[PDB]
Amino acid sequence: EVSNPSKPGRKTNQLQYMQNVVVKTLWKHQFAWPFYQPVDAIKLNLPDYHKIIKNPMDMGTIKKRLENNYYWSASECMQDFNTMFTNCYIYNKPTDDIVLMAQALEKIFLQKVAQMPQ
Numbered sequence: 517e518v519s520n521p522s523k524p525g526r527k528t529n530q531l532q533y534m535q536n537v538v539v540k541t542l543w544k545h546q547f548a549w550p551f552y553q554p555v556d557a558i559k560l561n562l563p564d565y566h567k568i569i570k571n572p573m574d575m576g577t578i579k580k581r582l583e584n585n586y587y588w589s590a591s592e593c594m595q596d597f598n599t600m601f602t603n604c605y606i607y608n609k610p611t612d613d614i615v616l617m618a619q620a621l622e623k624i625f626l627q628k629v630a631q632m633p634q
């Protein structure tokens with residue numbers, strides 16, 4: 517999940533940008549806090565969450581993956597962000613607050629990624 521002995525990982529120029537520009541800009545958004553940690557289906561009372569969401573993802577995991585050089589390339593790290601936002605749209609109702617919070621964060625994600633080098 518945040519490290520794998522058989523998985524090749526490294527740090528590239530792009531992966532440094534994911535960590536120092538993308539993760540770090542988003543972590544400081546006032547709507548980011550629900551994504552610091554995995555969805556806790558006990559605390560939030562979500563008996564069906566892990567039946568609908570097959571691959572949970574959050575920014576804490578991503579951040580930790582970056583610090584561990586878990587990833588091979590930055591597009592792999594972008595896929596994790598997409599999973600995290602997409603899970604949010606999939607599980608929740610169209611007008612739920614968390615949907616509108618994920619959309620605002622996702623927009624900034626793309627603006628930052630649009631300036632990534634290479």
Ligand SMILES: CCOc1cc(C(=O)N2CCC(N3CCN(C)CC3)CC2)ccc1Nc1ncc2c(n1)N(C1CCCC1)c1ccccc1C(=O)N2C
Nearest residue numbers: 549550551552553554555556560562603604607608613614
């Ligand atoms: C570890 C924090 O975790 C959460 C906490 C609380 C909470 O009650 N606190 C926050 C801190 C408390 N202190 C301490 C004592 N002191 C005196 C005052 C301050 C005060 C009350 C609420 C939601 C949380 N965490 C969450 N993580 C993913 C999700 C998530 N909430 N939301 C919600 C986020 C906001 C709207 C929806 C979801 C809800 C239902 C279904 C899915 C999802 C979902 O998709 N995600 C991504």
